[PDB]
């Protein structure tokens, strides 16, 4: 009802976790096909959930920055910088022990989300 | 709607993961207070989800066996033995790298579930 039975519902958002690896842009396109987007993380609850839903391997999430511009969410929303992004790259990934940046071309598993309903 | 926003919805069930450790019996009582039960795992999808929702630490789930009797789910349902339980103890736990048995008195984190709605 709230989410497809095959997606995971938590804190008013529906999540999908990939089984294959793609670059950040290709992962975002895959998310977009489901009416979703690389995961937007608005709270500590979401972050802790994702860091665990991810597992041991790095997973792309929805923060990216274009040269000379600020970090921006995958859905275009501006990032309020509620958490700090380590590293020197332009796309963000997470896994259980960390949230950091990696070259956007790297093929990683990914997580998408979209609002409930 | 389907589950409390604070619980995790997947495959028609709502999940809760503890932040503290308890014995199997005490964990089951905590689950029961929420109208839930130590997690019943009916499919490979549920199992893979739980092994990841759990993380690196062992978490009690809903399979236990009384001496001389078969493994039984925490809600009283008989176990169809769709998966094998390793070890020589009487309560089942899981984490990302395994699902096995442990002495029921051991205090572990736990996972509860209950049907959607
Ligand atoms: Zn879809
Ligand atoms: Zn409750």
mmCIF file with all atom_site columns, C-alpha atoms and ligand atoms in Angstrom:
data_model
loop_
_atom_site.group_PDB
_atom_site.id
_atom_site.type_symbol
_atom_site.label_atom_id
_atom_site.label_alt_id
_atom_site.label_comp_id
_atom_site.label_asym_id
_atom_site.label_entity_id
_atom_site.label_seq_id
_atom_site.pdbx_PDB_ins_code
_atom_site.Cartn_x
_atom_site.Cartn_y
_atom_site.Cartn_z
_atom_site.occupancy
_atom_site.B_iso_or_equiv
_atom_site.pdbx_formal_charge
_atom_site.auth_seq_id
_atom_site.auth_comp_id
_atom_site.auth_asym_id
_atom_site.auth_atom_id
_atom_site.pdbx_PDB_model_num
ATOM   1   C  CA  . UNK A 1 1   ? 0.000  0.000   0.000   1.00 0.00 ? 1   UNK A CA  1
ATOM   2   C  CA  . UNK A 1 2   ? 2.474  2.658   1.183   1.00 0.00 ? 2   UNK A CA  1
ATOM   3   C  CA  . UNK A 1 3   ? 5.225  1.242   -1.047  1.00 0.00 ? 3   UNK A CA  1
ATOM   4   C  CA  . UNK A 1 4   ? 5.569  -1.579  -3.483  1.00 0.00 ? 4   UNK A CA  1
ATOM   5   C  CA  . UNK A 1 5   ? 5.918  -4.743  -1.399  1.00 0.00 ? 5   UNK A CA  1
ATOM   6   C  CA  . UNK A 1 6   ? 9.332  -5.119  -3.085  1.00 0.00 ? 6   UNK A CA  1
ATOM   7   C  CA  . UNK A 1 7   ? 10.546 -1.726  -1.931  1.00 0.00 ? 7   UNK A CA  1
ATOM   8   C  CA  . UNK A 1 8   ? 11.346 -0.886  1.691   1.00 0.00 ? 8   UNK A CA  1
ATOM   9   C  CA  . UNK A 1 9   ? 9.222  1.670   3.517   1.00 0.00 ? 9   UNK A CA  1
ATOM   10  C  CA  . UNK A 1 10  ? 10.716 3.811   6.268   1.00 0.00 ? 10  UNK A CA  1
ATOM   11  C  CA  . UNK A 1 11  ? 10.031 7.307   7.564   1.00 0.00 ? 11  UNK A CA  1
ATOM   12  C  CA  . UNK A 1 12  ? 7.603  8.171   4.771   1.00 0.00 ? 12  UNK A CA  1
ATOM   13  C  CA  . UNK A 1 13  ? 9.941  7.139   1.966   1.00 0.00 ? 13  UNK A CA  1
ATOM   14  C  CA  . UNK A 1 14  ? 10.194 4.044   -0.193  1.00 0.00 ? 14  UNK A CA  1
ATOM   15  C  CA  . UNK A 1 15  ? 13.598 2.556   -0.864  1.00 0.00 ? 15  UNK A CA  1
ATOM   16  C  CA  . UNK A 1 16  ? 15.070 0.336   -3.537  1.00 0.00 ? 16  UNK A CA  1
ATOM   17  C  CA  . UNK A 1 17  ? 18.514 -1.225  -3.344  1.00 0.00 ? 17  UNK A CA  1
ATOM   18  C  CA  . UNK A 1 18  ? 20.290 -2.389  -6.504  1.00 0.00 ? 18  UNK A CA  1
ATOM   19  C  CA  . UNK A 1 19  ? 21.843 -5.797  -7.106  1.00 0.00 ? 19  UNK A CA  1
ATOM   20  C  CA  . UNK A 1 20  ? 24.201 -4.557  -9.827  1.00 0.00 ? 20  UNK A CA  1
ATOM   21  C  CA  . UNK A 1 21  ? 26.716 -1.715  -10.094 1.00 0.00 ? 21  UNK A CA  1
ATOM   22  C  CA  . UNK A 1 22  ? 26.504 1.468   -12.151 1.00 0.00 ? 22  UNK A CA  1
ATOM   23  C  CA  . UNK A 1 23  ? 28.086 4.898   -12.351 1.00 0.00 ? 23  UNK A CA  1
ATOM   24  C  CA  . UNK A 1 24  ? 26.308 7.651   -10.432 1.00 0.00 ? 24  UNK A CA  1
ATOM   25  C  CA  . UNK A 1 25  ? 24.633 9.051   -13.557 1.00 0.00 ? 25  UNK A CA  1
ATOM   26  C  CA  . UNK A 1 26  ? 23.546 5.640   -14.787 1.00 0.00 ? 26  UNK A CA  1
ATOM   27  C  CA  . UNK A 1 27  ? 22.258 4.720   -11.335 1.00 0.00 ? 27  UNK A CA  1
ATOM   28  C  CA  . UNK A 1 28  ? 20.250 7.963   -11.210 1.00 0.00 ? 28  UNK A CA  1
ATOM   29  C  CA  . UNK A 1 29  ? 18.706 7.113   -14.597 1.00 0.00 ? 29  UNK A CA  1
ATOM   30  C  CA  . UNK A 1 30  ? 17.718 3.676   -13.303 1.00 0.00 ? 30  UNK A CA  1
ATOM   31  C  CA  . UNK A 1 31  ? 16.116 5.321   -10.246 1.00 0.00 ? 31  UNK A CA  1
ATOM   32  C  CA  . UNK A 1 32  ? 14.302 7.833   -12.463 1.00 0.00 ? 32  UNK A CA  1
ATOM   33  C  CA  . UNK A 1 33  ? 12.685 4.990   -14.451 1.00 0.00 ? 33  UNK A CA  1
ATOM   34  C  CA  . UNK A 1 34  ? 10.921 3.939   -11.226 1.00 0.00 ? 34  UNK A CA  1
ATOM   35  C  CA  . UNK A 1 35  ? 9.784  7.507   -10.536 1.00 0.00 ? 35  UNK A CA  1
ATOM   36  C  CA  . UNK A 1 36  ? 12.483 7.639   -7.887  1.00 0.00 ? 36  UNK A CA  1
ATOM   37  C  CA  . UNK A 1 37  ? 15.862 9.271   -7.370  1.00 0.00 ? 37  UNK A CA  1
ATOM   38  C  CA  . UNK A 1 38  ? 19.243 8.387   -5.818  1.00 0.00 ? 38  UNK A CA  1
ATOM   39  C  CA  . UNK A 1 39  ? 18.454 8.444   -2.123  1.00 0.00 ? 39  UNK A CA  1
ATOM   40  C  CA  . UNK A 1 40  ? 17.789 11.785  -0.507  1.00 0.00 ? 40  UNK A CA  1
ATOM   41  C  CA  . UNK A 1 41  ? 18.754 11.684  3.171   1.00 0.00 ? 41  UNK A CA  1
ATOM   42  C  CA  . UNK A 1 42  ? 17.007 14.251  5.329   1.00 0.00 ? 42  UNK A CA  1
ATOM   43  C  CA  . UNK A 1 43  ? 17.521 12.930  8.852   1.00 0.00 ? 43  UNK A CA  1
ATOM   44  C  CA  . UNK A 1 44  ? 19.784 10.977  11.140  1.00 0.00 ? 44  UNK A CA  1
ATOM   45  C  CA  . UNK A 1 45  ? 17.142 8.232   11.194  1.00 0.00 ? 45  UNK A CA  1
ATOM   46  C  CA  . UNK A 1 46  ? 17.280 7.964   7.397   1.00 0.00 ? 46  UNK A CA  1
ATOM   47  C  CA  . UNK A 1 47  ? 21.072 7.992   7.467   1.00 0.00 ? 47  UNK A CA  1
ATOM   48  C  CA  . UNK A 1 48  ? 21.385 5.247   10.057  1.00 0.00 ? 48  UNK A CA  1
ATOM   49  C  CA  . UNK A 1 49  ? 18.795 3.154   8.196   1.00 0.00 ? 49  UNK A CA  1
ATOM   50  C  CA  . UNK A 1 50  ? 20.607 3.577   4.875   1.00 0.00 ? 50  UNK A CA  1
ATOM   51  C  CA  . UNK A 1 51  ? 24.052 2.865   6.291   1.00 0.00 ? 51  UNK A CA  1
ATOM   52  C  CA  . UNK A 1 52  ? 22.589 -0.457  7.443   1.00 0.00 ? 52  UNK A CA  1
ATOM   53  C  CA  . UNK A 1 53  ? 20.301 -1.193  4.433   1.00 0.00 ? 53  UNK A CA  1
ATOM   54  C  CA  . UNK A 1 54  ? 23.469 -0.765  2.358   1.00 0.00 ? 54  UNK A CA  1
ATOM   55  C  CA  . UNK A 1 55  ? 25.635 -3.384  4.072   1.00 0.00 ? 55  UNK A CA  1
ATOM   56  C  CA  . UNK A 1 56  ? 29.349 -3.761  3.615   1.00 0.00 ? 56  UNK A CA  1
ATOM   57  C  CA  . UNK A 1 57  ? 29.649 -2.527  0.009   1.00 0.00 ? 57  UNK A CA  1
ATOM   58  C  CA  . UNK A 1 58  ? 29.628 1.135   -1.092  1.00 0.00 ? 58  UNK A CA  1
ATOM   59  C  CA  . UNK A 1 59  ? 26.307 2.354   -2.456  1.00 0.00 ? 59  UNK A CA  1
ATOM   60  C  CA  . UNK A 1 60  ? 25.629 5.573   -4.345  1.00 0.00 ? 60  UNK A CA  1
ATOM   61  C  CA  . UNK A 1 61  ? 23.147 7.936   -2.748  1.00 0.00 ? 61  UNK A CA  1
ATOM   62  C  CA  . UNK A 1 62  ? 21.728 11.208  -3.981  1.00 0.00 ? 62  UNK A CA  1
ATOM   63  C  CA  . UNK A 1 63  ? 24.272 13.959  -3.391  1.00 0.00 ? 63  UNK A CA  1
ATOM   64  C  CA  . UNK A 1 64  ? 26.450 15.310  -6.206  1.00 0.00 ? 64  UNK A CA  1
ATOM   65  C  CA  . UNK A 1 65  ? 28.260 18.528  -6.908  1.00 0.00 ? 65  UNK A CA  1
ATOM   66  C  CA  . UNK A 1 66  ? 29.077 20.173  -10.202 1.00 0.00 ? 66  UNK A CA  1
ATOM   67  C  CA  . UNK A 1 67  ? 32.381 22.084  -10.341 1.00 0.00 ? 67  UNK A CA  1
ATOM   68  C  CA  . UNK A 1 68  ? 32.030 25.513  -8.740  1.00 0.00 ? 68  UNK A CA  1
ATOM   69  C  CA  . UNK A 1 69  ? 28.598 24.713  -7.369  1.00 0.00 ? 69  UNK A CA  1
ATOM   70  C  CA  . UNK A 1 70  ? 27.298 23.442  -4.049  1.00 0.00 ? 70  UNK A CA  1
ATOM   71  C  CA  . UNK A 1 71  ? 26.370 19.878  -3.198  1.00 0.00 ? 71  UNK A CA  1
ATOM   72  C  CA  . UNK A 1 72  ? 22.865 19.280  -4.503  1.00 0.00 ? 72  UNK A CA  1
ATOM   73  C  CA  . UNK A 1 73  ? 20.378 16.467  -4.067  1.00 0.00 ? 73  UNK A CA  1
ATOM   74  C  CA  . UNK A 1 74  ? 19.585 14.197  -7.004  1.00 0.00 ? 74  UNK A CA  1
ATOM   75  C  CA  . UNK A 1 75  ? 16.101 15.692  -7.262  1.00 0.00 ? 75  UNK A CA  1
ATOM   76  C  CA  . UNK A 1 76  ? 17.494 19.196  -7.592  1.00 0.00 ? 76  UNK A CA  1
ATOM   77  C  CA  . UNK A 1 77  ? 16.786 20.237  -3.988  1.00 0.00 ? 77  UNK A CA  1
ATOM   78  C  CA  . UNK A 1 78  ? 19.553 22.275  -2.420  1.00 0.00 ? 78  UNK A CA  1
ATOM   79  C  CA  . UNK A 1 79  ? 21.575 20.566  0.322   1.00 0.00 ? 79  UNK A CA  1
ATOM   80  C  CA  . UNK A 1 80  ? 21.342 22.154  3.768   1.00 0.00 ? 80  UNK A CA  1
ATOM   81  C  CA  . UNK A 1 81  ? 24.696 20.676  4.752   1.00 0.00 ? 81  UNK A CA  1
ATOM   82  C  CA  . UNK A 1 82  ? 23.236 18.953  7.805   1.00 0.00 ? 82  UNK A CA  1
ATOM   83  C  CA  . UNK A 1 83  ? 26.073 16.432  7.537   1.00 0.00 ? 83  UNK A CA  1
ATOM   84  C  CA  . UNK A 1 84  ? 29.616 16.779  6.256   1.00 0.00 ? 84  UNK A CA  1
ATOM   85  C  CA  . UNK A 1 85  ? 30.878 14.997  3.159   1.00 0.00 ? 85  UNK A CA  1
ATOM   86  C  CA  . UNK A 1 86  ? 34.458 13.773  3.483   1.00 0.00 ? 86  UNK A CA  1
ATOM   87  C  CA  . UNK A 1 87  ? 36.862 13.131  0.624   1.00 0.00 ? 87  UNK A CA  1
ATOM   88  C  CA  . UNK A 1 88  ? 37.631 15.193  -2.456  1.00 0.00 ? 88  UNK A CA  1
ATOM   89  C  CA  . UNK A 1 89  ? 35.271 13.712  -5.026  1.00 0.00 ? 89  UNK A CA  1
ATOM   90  C  CA  . UNK A 1 90  ? 31.956 14.897  -6.446  1.00 0.00 ? 90  UNK A CA  1
ATOM   91  C  CA  . UNK A 1 91  ? 29.437 12.097  -5.744  1.00 0.00 ? 91  UNK A CA  1
ATOM   92  C  CA  . UNK A 1 92  ? 28.397 10.640  -2.407  1.00 0.00 ? 92  UNK A CA  1
ATOM   93  C  CA  . UNK A 1 93  ? 28.212 6.990   -1.357  1.00 0.00 ? 93  UNK A CA  1
ATOM   94  C  CA  . UNK A 1 94  ? 27.645 5.259   1.925   1.00 0.00 ? 94  UNK A CA  1
ATOM   95  C  CA  . UNK A 1 95  ? 27.983 1.863   3.571   1.00 0.00 ? 95  UNK A CA  1
ATOM   96  C  CA  . UNK A 1 96  ? 27.875 0.807   7.224   1.00 0.00 ? 96  UNK A CA  1
ATOM   97  C  CA  . UNK A 1 97  ? 31.146 2.407   8.345   1.00 0.00 ? 97  UNK A CA  1
ATOM   98  C  CA  . UNK A 1 98  ? 30.954 5.634   6.436   1.00 0.00 ? 98  UNK A CA  1
ATOM   99  C  CA  . UNK A 1 99  ? 29.449 8.217   4.166   1.00 0.00 ? 99  UNK A CA  1
ATOM   100 C  CA  . UNK A 1 100 ? 31.992 9.858   1.866   1.00 0.00 ? 100 UNK A CA  1
ATOM   101 C  CA  . UNK A 1 101 ? 32.694 10.919  -1.704  1.00 0.00 ? 101 UNK A CA  1
ATOM   102 C  CA  . UNK A 1 102 ? 33.909 8.996   -4.738  1.00 0.00 ? 102 UNK A CA  1
ATOM   103 C  CA  . UNK A 1 103 ? 34.526 9.722   -8.420  1.00 0.00 ? 103 UNK A CA  1
ATOM   104 C  CA  . UNK A 1 104 ? 31.116 9.733   -10.069 1.00 0.00 ? 104 UNK A CA  1
ATOM   105 C  CA  . UNK A 1 105 ? 32.259 7.367   -12.831 1.00 0.00 ? 105 UNK A CA  1
ATOM   106 C  CA  . UNK A 1 106 ? 32.898 4.523   -10.390 1.00 0.00 ? 106 UNK A CA  1
ATOM   107 C  CA  . UNK A 1 107 ? 30.390 1.712   -10.764 1.00 0.00 ? 107 UNK A CA  1
ATOM   108 C  CA  . UNK A 1 108 ? 28.789 1.030   -7.379  1.00 0.00 ? 108 UNK A CA  1
ATOM   109 C  CA  . UNK A 1 109 ? 25.576 -0.513  -6.109  1.00 0.00 ? 109 UNK A CA  1
ATOM   110 C  CA  . UNK A 1 110 ? 22.986 2.198   -5.420  1.00 0.00 ? 110 UNK A CA  1
ATOM   111 C  CA  . UNK A 1 111 ? 19.929 3.078   -3.386  1.00 0.00 ? 111 UNK A CA  1
ATOM   112 C  CA  . UNK A 1 112 ? 16.929 4.985   -4.628  1.00 0.00 ? 112 UNK A CA  1
ATOM   113 C  CA  . UNK A 1 113 ? 14.078 6.522   -2.776  1.00 0.00 ? 113 UNK A CA  1
ATOM   114 C  CA  . UNK A 1 114 ? 10.820 8.341   -3.361  1.00 0.00 ? 114 UNK A CA  1
ATOM   115 C  CA  . UNK A 1 115 ? 8.002  9.600   -1.120  1.00 0.00 ? 115 UNK A CA  1
ATOM   116 C  CA  . UNK A 1 116 ? 5.321  7.193   0.243   1.00 0.00 ? 116 UNK A CA  1
ATOM   117 C  CA  . UNK A 1 117 ? 2.089  6.713   -1.732  1.00 0.00 ? 117 UNK A CA  1
ATOM   118 C  CA  . UNK B 2 1   ? -0.028 3.927   6.759   1.00 0.00 ? 1   UNK B CA  1
ATOM   119 C  CA  . UNK B 2 2   ? 1.130  0.344   6.129   1.00 0.00 ? 2   UNK B CA  1
ATOM   120 C  CA  . UNK B 2 3   ? 3.474  0.460   9.137   1.00 0.00 ? 3   UNK B CA  1
ATOM   121 C  CA  . UNK B 2 4   ? 4.401  2.957   11.766  1.00 0.00 ? 4   UNK B CA  1
ATOM   122 C  CA  . UNK B 2 5   ? 6.760  5.431   10.095  1.00 0.00 ? 5   UNK B CA  1
ATOM   123 C  CA  . UNK B 2 6   ? 9.324  4.283   12.692  1.00 0.00 ? 6   UNK B CA  1
ATOM   124 C  CA  . UNK B 2 7   ? 9.075  0.643   11.685  1.00 0.00 ? 7   UNK B CA  1
ATOM   125 C  CA  . UNK B 2 8   ? 10.366 -0.729  8.382   1.00 0.00 ? 8   UNK B CA  1
ATOM   126 C  CA  . UNK B 2 9   ? 7.900  -2.116  5.856   1.00 0.00 ? 9   UNK B CA  1
ATOM   127 C  CA  . UNK B 2 10  ? 8.920  -4.897  3.489   1.00 0.00 ? 10  UNK B CA  1
ATOM   128 C  CA  . UNK B 2 11  ? 7.071  -7.748  1.807   1.00 0.00 ? 11  UNK B CA  1
ATOM   129 C  CA  . UNK B 2 12  ? 3.850  -7.171  3.739   1.00 0.00 ? 12  UNK B CA  1
ATOM   130 C  CA  . UNK B 2 13  ? 5.506  -7.158  7.152   1.00 0.00 ? 13  UNK B CA  1
ATOM   131 C  CA  . UNK B 2 14  ? 6.563  -4.396  9.510   1.00 0.00 ? 14  UNK B CA  1
ATOM   132 C  CA  . UNK B 2 15  ? 9.925  -4.633  11.213  1.00 0.00 ? 15  UNK B CA  1
ATOM   133 C  CA  . UNK B 2 16  ? 11.449 -3.177  14.342  1.00 0.00 ? 16  UNK B CA  1
ATOM   134 C  CA  . UNK B 2 17  ? 15.120 -3.430  15.235  1.00 0.00 ? 17  UNK B CA  1
ATOM   135 C  CA  . UNK B 2 18  ? 16.268 -3.012  18.840  1.00 0.00 ? 18  UNK B CA  1
ATOM   136 C  CA  . UNK B 2 19  ? 18.997 -0.695  20.095  1.00 0.00 ? 19  UNK B CA  1
ATOM   137 C  CA  . UNK B 2 20  ? 19.629 -2.697  23.272  1.00 0.00 ? 20  UNK B CA  1
ATOM   138 C  CA  . UNK B 2 21  ? 20.331 -6.359  24.029  1.00 0.00 ? 21  UNK B CA  1
ATOM   139 C  CA  . UNK B 2 22  ? 18.085 -8.916  25.712  1.00 0.00 ? 22  UNK B CA  1
ATOM   140 C  CA  . UNK B 2 23  ? 17.747 -12.663 26.101  1.00 0.00 ? 23  UNK B CA  1
ATOM   141 C  CA  . UNK B 2 24  ? 15.505 -14.391 23.569  1.00 0.00 ? 24  UNK B CA  1
ATOM   142 C  CA  . UNK B 2 25  ? 12.571 -14.616 25.991  1.00 0.00 ? 25  UNK B CA  1
ATOM   143 C  CA  . UNK B 2 26  ? 12.914 -11.015 27.108  1.00 0.00 ? 26  UNK B CA  1
ATOM   144 C  CA  . UNK B 2 27  ? 13.232 -9.848  23.508  1.00 0.00 ? 27  UNK B CA  1
ATOM   145 C  CA  . UNK B 2 28  ? 10.066 -11.771 22.594  1.00 0.00 ? 28  UNK B CA  1
ATOM   146 C  CA  . UNK B 2 29  ? 8.221  -10.058 25.465  1.00 0.00 ? 29  UNK B CA  1
ATOM   147 C  CA  . UNK B 2 30  ? 9.366  -6.661  24.195  1.00 0.00 ? 30  UNK B CA  1
ATOM   148 C  CA  . UNK B 2 31  ? 8.109  -7.578  20.702  1.00 0.00 ? 31  UNK B CA  1
ATOM   149 C  CA  . UNK B 2 32  ? 4.792  -8.781  22.136  1.00 0.00 ? 32  UNK B CA  1
ATOM   150 C  CA  . UNK B 2 33  ? 4.212  -5.378  23.790  1.00 0.00 ? 33  UNK B CA  1
ATOM   151 C  CA  . UNK B 2 34  ? 4.131  -3.856  20.284  1.00 0.00 ? 34  UNK B CA  1
ATOM   152 C  CA  . UNK B 2 35  ? 1.700  -6.515  19.049  1.00 0.00 ? 35  UNK B CA  1
ATOM   153 C  CA  . UNK B 2 36  ? 4.641  -8.084  17.261  1.00 0.00 ? 36  UNK B CA  1
ATOM   154 C  CA  . UNK B 2 37  ? 6.853  -11.142 17.596  1.00 0.00 ? 37  UNK B CA  1
ATOM   155 C  CA  . UNK B 2 38  ? 10.534 -12.059 17.120  1.00 0.00 ? 38  UNK B CA  1
ATOM   156 C  CA  . UNK B 2 39  ? 10.881 -12.003 13.358  1.00 0.00 ? 39  UNK B CA  1
ATOM   157 C  CA  . UNK B 2 40  ? 9.211  -14.749 11.386  1.00 0.00 ? 40  UNK B CA  1
ATOM   158 C  CA  . UNK B 2 41  ? 11.098 -15.374 8.143   1.00 0.00 ? 41  UNK B CA  1
ATOM   159 C  CA  . UNK B 2 42  ? 9.036  -16.971 5.404   1.00 0.00 ? 42  UNK B CA  1
ATOM   160 C  CA  . UNK B 2 43  ? 11.073 -16.300 2.270   1.00 0.00 ? 43  UNK B CA  1
ATOM   161 C  CA  . UNK B 2 44  ? 14.525 -15.804 0.853   1.00 0.00 ? 44  UNK B CA  1
ATOM   162 C  CA  . UNK B 2 45  ? 13.613 -12.153 0.258   1.00 0.00 ? 45  UNK B CA  1
ATOM   163 C  CA  . UNK B 2 46  ? 12.790 -11.711 3.950   1.00 0.00 ? 46  UNK B CA  1
ATOM   164 C  CA  . UNK B 2 47  ? 15.973 -13.516 4.944   1.00 0.00 ? 47  UNK B CA  1
ATOM   165 C  CA  . UNK B 2 48  ? 18.247 -11.432 2.748   1.00 0.00 ? 48  UNK B CA  1
ATOM   166 C  CA  . UNK B 2 49  ? 16.536 -8.242  3.953   1.00 0.00 ? 49  UNK B CA  1
ATOM   167 C  CA  . UNK B 2 50  ? 16.926 -9.226  7.610   1.00 0.00 ? 50  UNK B CA  1
ATOM   168 C  CA  . UNK B 2 51  ? 20.543 -10.315 7.270   1.00 0.00 ? 51  UNK B CA  1
ATOM   169 C  CA  . UNK B 2 52  ? 21.196 -6.786  5.995   1.00 0.00 ? 52  UNK B CA  1
ATOM   170 C  CA  . UNK B 2 53  ? 18.781 -4.851  8.289   1.00 0.00 ? 53  UNK B CA  1
ATOM   171 C  CA  . UNK B 2 54  ? 20.653 -6.564  11.132  1.00 0.00 ? 54  UNK B CA  1
ATOM   172 C  CA  . UNK B 2 55  ? 24.176 -5.395  10.284  1.00 0.00 ? 55  UNK B CA  1
ATOM   173 C  CA  . UNK B 2 56  ? 27.335 -6.770  11.790  1.00 0.00 ? 56  UNK B CA  1
ATOM   174 C  CA  . UNK B 2 57  ? 25.999 -7.740  15.237  1.00 0.00 ? 57  UNK B CA  1
ATOM   175 C  CA  . UNK B 2 58  ? 23.957 -10.876 16.024  1.00 0.00 ? 58  UNK B CA  1
ATOM   176 C  CA  . UNK B 2 59  ? 20.221 -10.296 16.312  1.00 0.00 ? 59  UNK B CA  1
ATOM   177 C  CA  . UNK B 2 60  ? 17.615 -12.678 17.701  1.00 0.00 ? 60  UNK B CA  1
ATOM   178 C  CA  . UNK B 2 61  ? 14.876 -13.710 15.307  1.00 0.00 ? 61  UNK B CA  1
ATOM   179 C  CA  . UNK B 2 62  ? 11.809 -15.838 15.856  1.00 0.00 ? 62  UNK B CA  1
ATOM   180 C  CA  . UNK B 2 63  ? 12.817 -19.494 15.807  1.00 0.00 ? 63  UNK B CA  1
ATOM   181 C  CA  . UNK B 2 64  ? 13.220 -21.504 19.016  1.00 0.00 ? 64  UNK B CA  1
ATOM   182 C  CA  . UNK B 2 65  ? 13.032 -25.135 19.966  1.00 0.00 ? 65  UNK B CA  1
ATOM   183 C  CA  . UNK B 2 66  ? 12.022 -26.731 23.230  1.00 0.00 ? 66  UNK B CA  1
ATOM   184 C  CA  . UNK B 2 67  ? 13.856 -29.952 24.152  1.00 0.00 ? 67  UNK B CA  1
ATOM   185 C  CA  . UNK B 2 68  ? 12.404 -32.921 22.277  1.00 0.00 ? 68  UNK B CA  1
ATOM   186 C  CA  . UNK B 2 69  ? 10.288 -30.707 20.060  1.00 0.00 ? 69  UNK B CA  1
ATOM   187 C  CA  . UNK B 2 70  ? 10.724 -29.216 16.608  1.00 0.00 ? 70  UNK B CA  1
ATOM   188 C  CA  . UNK B 2 71  ? 11.856 -25.703 15.788  1.00 0.00 ? 71  UNK B CA  1
ATOM   189 C  CA  . UNK B 2 72  ? 8.833  -23.441 16.098  1.00 0.00 ? 72  UNK B CA  1
ATOM   190 C  CA  . UNK B 2 73  ? 8.190  -19.831 15.185  1.00 0.00 ? 73  UNK B CA  1
ATOM   191 C  CA  . UNK B 2 74  ? 7.766  -17.250 17.936  1.00 0.00 ? 74  UNK B CA  1
ATOM   192 C  CA  . UNK B 2 75  ? 4.075  -16.915 17.101  1.00 0.00 ? 75  UNK B CA  1
ATOM   193 C  CA  . UNK B 2 76  ? 3.507  -20.631 17.556  1.00 0.00 ? 76  UNK B CA  1
ATOM   194 C  CA  . UNK B 2 77  ? 3.436  -21.473 13.834  1.00 0.00 ? 77  UNK B CA  1
ATOM   195 C  CA  . UNK B 2 78  ? 5.239  -24.676 12.963  1.00 0.00 ? 78  UNK B CA  1
ATOM   196 C  CA  . UNK B 2 79  ? 8.502  -24.314 11.026  1.00 0.00 ? 79  UNK B CA  1
ATOM   197 C  CA  . UNK B 2 80  ? 8.528  -25.850 7.548   1.00 0.00 ? 80  UNK B CA  1
ATOM   198 C  CA  . UNK B 2 81  ? 12.306 -26.189 7.652   1.00 0.00 ? 81  UNK B CA  1
ATOM   199 C  CA  . UNK B 2 82  ? 12.745 -24.207 4.443   1.00 0.00 ? 82  UNK B CA  1
ATOM   200 C  CA  . UNK B 2 83  ? 16.229 -23.297 5.675   1.00 0.00 ? 83  UNK B CA  1
ATOM   201 C  CA  . UNK B 2 84  ? 18.676 -25.170 7.869   1.00 0.00 ? 84  UNK B CA  1
ATOM   202 C  CA  . UNK B 2 85  ? 19.700 -23.972 11.314  1.00 0.00 ? 85  UNK B CA  1
ATOM   203 C  CA  . UNK B 2 86  ? 23.363 -24.595 12.095  1.00 0.00 ? 86  UNK B CA  1
ATOM   204 C  CA  . UNK B 2 87  ? 24.878 -24.951 15.551  1.00 0.00 ? 87  UNK B CA  1
ATOM   205 C  CA  . UNK B 2 88  ? 23.693 -26.908 18.568  1.00 0.00 ? 88  UNK B CA  1
ATOM   206 C  CA  . UNK B 2 89  ? 21.689 -24.314 20.472  1.00 0.00 ? 89  UNK B CA  1
ATOM   207 C  CA  . UNK B 2 90  ? 17.959 -23.702 20.818  1.00 0.00 ? 90  UNK B CA  1
ATOM   208 C  CA  . UNK B 2 91  ? 17.357 -20.107 19.640  1.00 0.00 ? 91  UNK B CA  1
ATOM   209 C  CA  . UNK B 2 92  ? 18.104 -18.575 16.259  1.00 0.00 ? 92  UNK B CA  1
ATOM   210 C  CA  . UNK B 2 93  ? 19.953 -15.349 15.463  1.00 0.00 ? 93  UNK B CA  1
ATOM   211 C  CA  . UNK B 2 94  ? 21.208 -13.794 12.286  1.00 0.00 ? 94  UNK B CA  1
ATOM   212 C  CA  . UNK B 2 95  ? 23.544 -11.080 11.047  1.00 0.00 ? 95  UNK B CA  1
ATOM   213 C  CA  . UNK B 2 96  ? 24.972 -10.360 7.596   1.00 0.00 ? 96  UNK B CA  1
ATOM   214 C  CA  . UNK B 2 97  ? 27.276 -13.381 7.324   1.00 0.00 ? 97  UNK B CA  1
ATOM   215 C  CA  . UNK B 2 98  ? 25.069 -15.997 8.868   1.00 0.00 ? 98  UNK B CA  1
ATOM   216 C  CA  . UNK B 2 99  ? 21.962 -17.404 10.435  1.00 0.00 ? 99  UNK B CA  1
ATOM   217 C  CA  . UNK B 2 100 ? 22.679 -19.876 13.232  1.00 0.00 ? 100 UNK B CA  1
ATOM   218 C  CA  . UNK B 2 101 ? 21.770 -20.884 16.770  1.00 0.00 ? 101 UNK B CA  1
ATOM   219 C  CA  . UNK B 2 102 ? 22.839 -19.543 20.152  1.00 0.00 ? 102 UNK B CA  1
ATOM   220 C  CA  . UNK B 2 103 ? 21.984 -20.209 23.798  1.00 0.00 ? 103 UNK B CA  1
ATOM   221 C  CA  . UNK B 2 104 ? 18.660 -18.503 24.420  1.00 0.00 ? 104 UNK B CA  1
ATOM   222 C  CA  . UNK B 2 105 ? 19.952 -16.758 27.553  1.00 0.00 ? 105 UNK B CA  1
ATOM   223 C  CA  . UNK B 2 106 ? 22.503 -14.727 25.599  1.00 0.00 ? 106 UNK B CA  1
ATOM   224 C  CA  . UNK B 2 107 ? 21.615 -11.050 25.455  1.00 0.00 ? 107 UNK B CA  1
ATOM   225 C  CA  . UNK B 2 108 ? 21.542 -9.942  21.815  1.00 0.00 ? 108 UNK B CA  1
ATOM   226 C  CA  . UNK B 2 109 ? 19.928 -7.168  19.808  1.00 0.00 ? 109 UNK B CA  1
ATOM   227 C  CA  . UNK B 2 110 ? 16.681 -8.391  18.231  1.00 0.00 ? 110 UNK B CA  1
ATOM   228 C  CA  . UNK B 2 111 ? 14.278 -7.879  15.364  1.00 0.00 ? 111 UNK B CA  1
ATOM   229 C  CA  . UNK B 2 112 ? 10.522 -8.064  15.576  1.00 0.00 ? 112 UNK B CA  1
ATOM   230 C  CA  . UNK B 2 113 ? 7.933  -8.214  12.894  1.00 0.00 ? 113 UNK B CA  1
ATOM   231 C  CA  . UNK B 2 114 ? 4.187  -8.247  12.412  1.00 0.00 ? 114 UNK B CA  1
ATOM   232 C  CA  . UNK B 2 115 ? 1.864  -8.195  9.387   1.00 0.00 ? 115 UNK B CA  1
ATOM   233 C  CA  . UNK B 2 116 ? 1.127  -4.917  7.503   1.00 0.00 ? 116 UNK B CA  1
ATOM   234 C  CA  . UNK B 2 117 ? -1.909 -2.839  8.522   1.00 0.00 ? 117 UNK B CA  1
HETATM 235 ZN ZN1 . LIG C 3 .   ? 9.755  0.383   -10.620 1.00 0.00 ? 1   LIG C ZN1 1
HETATM 236 ZN ZN1 . LIG C 3 .   ? 4.990  -0.222  19.631  1.00 0.00 ? 2   LIG C ZN1 1
#
